[PDB]
Design a protein around this nucleic acid. Structure first.
Ligand SMILES: [Zn+2]
Ligand SMILES: [Zn+2]
Ligand SMILES: [Zn+2]
Lengths: 219, 199, 60, 199, 199, 160, 160
RNA sequence: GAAGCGCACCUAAUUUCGAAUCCAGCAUGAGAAGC
C-alpha cells in the first residue's frame, strides 16, 4: 500500500501538522518517504528513507565509531554477467598466481628459435614397429611434431620427459605396449622409442614431416 | 507462425557434472594443469550442449515406443525429415523448430568449477596405478537455457518435458557411467506472440 | 491484540522488504586483467539498518 | 532397448568409512583443520564413487573364476570390449550399459560426518610418535544409488549383486585394511520401460 | 588371487578394556560426563583398532627374532616394502593383503560399558589427590573381527596367530601397563574362494 | 627507450595513483617494448606458419562403370561432392586420383570407418563393405580411362 | 616509460628476447611497477585507512642448486614441501618465512620438526645438520625474486 | 548410614602419483528476377 485519512492499512507514505497526519493513520506506516523533520519522524519510532545485484563477499569486523556503523575495507569491485561482487586482496592474489602460472606456461625454453645416429630405413622400421604395438601412438607422434617445430631442444626435453622412469613409481610416460611381453622386452622397446625419437631429432624438418605423415596424416 | 512456445529451463546439479572443453587452445592452456577441463565461456561460465541431449533422449524413447522415428546417431546418418524429432530438432531440408539454447550457468568457474583427482587402482595391489586431474561442476550449480519453438504443435511441451525427465534419469555431459551429470529440471513454459517485439 | 491495535501496531494471530546492497561508487573506470572486469577501490562498508552500502573516502 | 533395469541400492554403513576429498580447493580449505577430508558434496552430502568398486569387484571375481576378463586396473590398461565387465562398465569403443550413480548420503555433513584423531605409536617406547586427524562417516549412515542398465541381459543383476557382496566383504572406499568401509547393501530391482517418460 | 583367507577372530575381554574416543565431537559431548570416553559406534557398539596392534606386535617379535622388518611406528617412517609385515599390512607402494576389520562388540554400550573412578593418591599423606572418570568395557564382553587376506601365503595365518598370542600377553587398547585390555582370542580360519559370490 | 604498446585506456584510480593490472611480454630489440598476449599469439602463429612453410587398374566394362555409378549414386555412396573431387583429382593426373581413392577407402585401424557416405537403405554390414569395395573398383577403373570419357561419364551424375 | 622491474629470466623466442610478465601500469612519469609495489601500496592504504577509523642468510645460487638436489635425493625437501613453500612464497616473503619457521621448529614437548625424515643411514647429528641445511637453503631462496625461485624449483617439482 | 573429589598435558604431521588413447568426416543447393 502506497499513500501519496485513508482508514485502510498504509505500509508506505510519500510526503507539526505532518506529524499529526502521520499519527492519525490507523496502524503505523512501516517506511515514510520524506532533514530535521525526518529525524523528528524518527523520534516517533517510525522509519524514514530520505531519498546488477550487489554481493559483498567479505569477512566482517565492525567498529561502531560514529553514529553510523562502519567496516574499513579497501578492496575490489568485480563486474560480472548479471551481478556485481566485492572481493578482498586474497581473491586478487589467487587470480594473480593463476595468471602468473599461465604466463610462464608460455615462452617456455626456446620455442621456434648430442643426438644418436641410425639409418632412415631403421627409423621407419622402429616407428612402424612401435605404431602397431601402441607405444608411438598418433597422439605421441603429434606432440613429437609440435615439440619438434619449436626446436630440437624442446623435442629433447619432451622425449626426456616421456622416457623418464620416475624413481617413486617406476613408470615411464610411454603408452604401454600391446601384446605378450616380459618386463625386459618392455624396457628394451621403451629404449628403442628413446633412441628412434632422439635420432630423428637430428634430422631436418622435411625428413621428419615425410616420416610422420604415413603414421599421422593430420600432423 | 503467429505464436511461439518459450520453455525456460532451469537445471540444478544433484551430482558432480563434467562436460569437456572443445576449443583446442583452451584445452591446451588447461591441460598444463588439468587433464579434463569443463567446457567454459570466454566470460568464464560453463556451457553444456543441450540439443543433442534432448534429441538423443527423444529418439531413444520414441524408438522404444515404436513410432517411425529416425536415428541421427549413427555415423553420417541422414535424418529422414518425416518424423517427430525431425520436426522438432531438424532435418536436411527443414531446420528444427525448437531452437535449443546452450545450458549457460548462472555462476562462474571460481564458484562452480572445482579441480578434481581421479584414480585408477590396480586390482591385485590396491595401489593407485594411475591418476589424472579433471575439472568438474559442483552439485547445486544452476544452469539456464531457453527452448524457442516456432510454429508450435500440441505435443511439443510434453516431448521436451519427457526428454528432460530422461536427462534427469540418465545424465547430461560426460562421465555419465561413473555417476556424473545427474540433474533436475524446472520448466517455465509460456506461449508468446511472434509480433511481441514490434512497438 | 485490541490494546496493540489501540497502540497502532498490526497483529495477525496464527510487503517485500529486501535488505539490498548499494554500490555508491563509480564503475566507469574498470579494466580487464584476466577475464574479469575489476577495479581496486578504497572505501568503507557502512551498515545502515535499511541497506548495506559501500562508500569512498569522501563519505568518511 | 525398450526395457531398462533400475537397481536401487541402499548402503548402510556398519564400520567407519573414509572416502577422500578429490577437490584441491576443498582439500586446501579443509587441510588447515583436518588432514584427511571426506569427499563431500557442495550440498554437504557425502560422495562415494561406486562404478570403480563394482568394476574392480567383478574383475577380481571373474578373473578368479577363470572367465575372460581383462585387467583394467593396470596402469594405462586399454579394455578389450569383448569381455563381460566391458559390456557393463565400458570399453575403448563402447560405453557401459550400466550407468552407476554416486553413493550420495541421505543425511548431511554434521549429522554423519565426524572428525577424528588417528595415531602412530613407537614400538619400543609405546608413545604417540605421530598424530593426524581424519574425517570419517558414522555407522548406520544410509547412502542411496541407482544403477540404470540400458540394454539389459539376465546376468547383469546377479553380477551387480555379487559385486555388492564382494564390497560387503572387502569395503567401498578408503582405508579398507584397517577396518574402514565394511558396509551392507539392500537391493531393489525393477525392469522399467524406456518409454515410461514419454506421455 | 584364486583363494582368500578368512580369520574370524572372537575376542573375550579378560580384564577391563579402554580404547579412547577418537571423534572430537563425541569426546567433547562427553567431557562433562566422562573424562575418558571409550571408542564407540553410532550404533553404540565398541570400536577397537586392530590392524595397528597386529602390525606393532609382529614388528616387535620379528625384530627381536632377527628377521628383516621395517620399524614403521617411528615418526613419518616409510615402510620398506620388502618385509613380511609390509606384505601382510602394507607399504606405501603396495597395500596389505590382510585387510583387518575393527573389533566390533556383539553387545551395546548399555550392557558392556561402565563409568569408573580412577584415582591419583599422594604418597606421604596417603590421600586422594586427583579423581577422574573413565569408561571401561567390562570383562566377558565379546568382540568380533574378520581378517581377509587377499593373496594368502603359507605363513600368514601363523603370523596372525602369533601376533594374537602377543596381544593376549601384552594387551589391546589403552592403559596397558595398569592391567587394562588383557584379552583372549579364538581364531576360526577358512580358505574361501574369491569367486564364491558369482552365481 | 621503453615503448608501451599496452592500451593506456581503462585504468583505475587507487591510493591517489592511477593503475591497471597488466599481463604481457617484454621484448628486447634500441627498444625495450611492452607487448600483450595478442602480440605473442601473432608472433607464435607467424613462427609456426614459418616452420610449417617447409612442407613438401582393374578395367571392367564401360556399361559396368555406368551401372555401378548409377547404383552408388542412388544408394548414396558416390555423391556429387565425391564425383567433383574425383574429377579434380583425375584432372591433376591418375596417381593423385590413386591417392584420393586410397584416402577415402582407407579403413581406420581403430574405428573401422571408411570416409565414404553410409549407403542409404537397409543393407547388411557385409553388403555395406562390399559396396565400399565396388565403389573402390569402379572409381579405380575409371582412373584407367582418358579425360574425355571420364568427363562425359561423370557429367551425367554431376552436371557441374 | 621507466621499467623499474627485474630483467633476468629473459628467454629467447625466435629472434626476440621475451619474458612472461605480469604487473601494473602507473601513470604519475610512467612506471611499470610489479606486485611488490602493489602489496606495499595496499598495506600502506589498509594500514592508513584502518587507523583513520580507529635478515636472510646469504647463500650462492650454485650452492642452492646443489643443496636442494641433495635434500631432494634424501627426501627432506619433497615435491609437496617445495609446492607448499612456493605457495607461501607467492603470498610474500614474511608468510613464507613463517612457513619455513613452522616447518623447522623443534617442538619442545616432542623434539620433532615438521621436516620429512631423511632417507639413508644418517646419525641424529647429521640429521639435525641436514635440517639446518634445509632451513638455510629455503630461507636463502626466500631472498630471491619470484622468477628466479620459479626457475630453481621447476627443475625439482614440475607441477609448480 | 554420611561426606570430599571427579581434573589435567603432549601430538594433531608426512609422502607418491597427477598420465594415456581413438576420431576431426561427410551431404544438399550453384539459381531466380527486374531496371
Ligand atoms: Zn527423422
Ligand atoms: Zn575386456
Ligand atoms: Zn617393511
Amino acid at each position: 500500500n502506497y499513500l501519496f485519512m485513508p482508514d485502510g492499512n498504509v505500509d508506505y507514505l510519500i510526503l507539526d501538522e505532518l506529524i499529526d497526519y502521520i499519527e492519525r493513520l490507523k496502524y503505523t506506516p512501516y517506511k515514510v518517504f520524506l532533514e530535521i523533520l525526518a529525524k523528528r519522524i524518527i523520534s516517533k519510532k517510525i522509519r524514514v528513507e530520505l531519498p546488477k545485484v550487489v554481493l559483498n563477499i567479505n569477512t566482517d569486523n565492525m567498529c561502531n565509531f560514529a553514529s553510523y556503523r562502519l567496516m574499513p575495507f579497501s578492496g575490489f569491485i568485480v563486474e560480472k554477467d548479471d551481478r556485481i561482487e566485492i572481493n578482498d586482496k586474497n581473491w586478487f592474489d589467487m587470480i594473480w598466481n593463476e595468471e602468473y602460472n599461465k604466463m610462464r606456461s608460455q615462452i617456455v625454453a626456446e620455442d621456434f628459435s648430442a643426438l644418436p645416429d641410425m639409418s632412415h630405413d631403421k627409423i621407419i622400421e622402429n616407428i612402424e614397429y612401435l605404431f602397431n604395438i601402441k607405444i608411438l601412438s598418433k597422439n605421441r607422434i603429434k606432440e613429437f611434431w609440435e615439440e619438434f617445430c619449436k626446436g630440437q631442444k624442446a623435442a629433447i626435453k619432451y622425449i626426456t620427459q616421456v622416457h623418464r622412469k620416475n624413481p617413486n613409481t617406476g613408470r615411464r610416460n610411454w603408452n604401454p605396449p600391446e601384446g605378450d611381453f616380459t618386463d625386459n622386452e618392455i624396457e628394451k622397446l621403451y629404449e628403442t622409442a628413446y633412441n628412434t625419437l632422439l635420432s630423428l631429432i637430428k634430422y631436418d624438418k622435411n625428413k621428419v614431416y615425410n616420416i610422420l605423415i604415413n603414421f599421422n596424416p593430420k600432423l | 507462425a503467429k505464436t511461439m512456445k518459450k520453455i525456460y529451463v532451469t537445471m540444478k546439479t544433484l551430482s558432480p557434472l563434467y562436460t569437456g572443453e572443445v576449443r583446442r587452445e583452451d584445452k591446451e592452456a588447461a591441460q598444463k594443469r588439468v587433464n579434463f577441463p569443463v567446457r567454459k565461456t570466454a566470460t568464464n561460465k560453463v556451457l553444456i550442449p543441450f540439443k543433442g541431449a534432448l534429441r538423443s533422449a527423444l529418439e531413444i524413447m520414441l524408438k522404444a515406443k515404436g513410432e517411425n522415428v529416425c536415428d541421427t546417431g549413427e555415423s553420417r546418418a541422414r535424418p529422414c525429415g518425416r518424423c517427430v524429432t525431425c520436426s522438432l530438432f531438424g532435418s536436411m531440408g527443414r531446420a528444427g523448430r525448437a531452437s535449443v539454447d546452450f545450458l549457460i550457468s548462472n555462476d562462474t568457474k571460481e564458484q562452480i568449477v572445482r579441480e578434481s583427482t581421479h584414480l585408477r587402482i590396480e586390482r591385485q595391489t590396491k595401489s593407485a596405478s594411475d591418476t589424472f586431474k579433471g575439472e568438474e561442476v559442483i552439485e547445486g550449480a544452476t544452469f539456464t537455457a531457453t527452448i524457442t519453438i516456432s510454429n508450435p504443435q500440441e505435443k511439443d511441451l510434453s516431448l521436451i518435458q519427457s526428454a528432460l525427465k530422461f536427462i534427469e534419469e540418465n545424465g547430461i555431459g560426460g562421465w555419465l557411467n561413473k555417476g556424473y551429470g545427474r540433474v533436475s529440471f524446472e520448466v517455465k513454459s509460456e506461449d508468446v506472440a511472434t509480433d511481441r517485439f514490434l512497438k | 491484540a485490541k490494546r496493540i491495535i489501540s497502540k497502532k501496531i498490526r497483529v495477525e494471530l496464527p510487503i517485500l522488504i529486501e535488505k539490498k546492497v548499494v554500490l555508491n561508487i563509480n564503475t566507469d573506470n574498470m579494466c580487464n586483467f584476466a577475464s574479469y572486469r575489476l577495479m581496486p577501490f578504497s572505501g568503507f562498508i557502512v551498515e545502515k539498518d535499511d541497506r548495506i552500502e559501500i562508500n569512498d573516502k569522501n563519505w568518511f
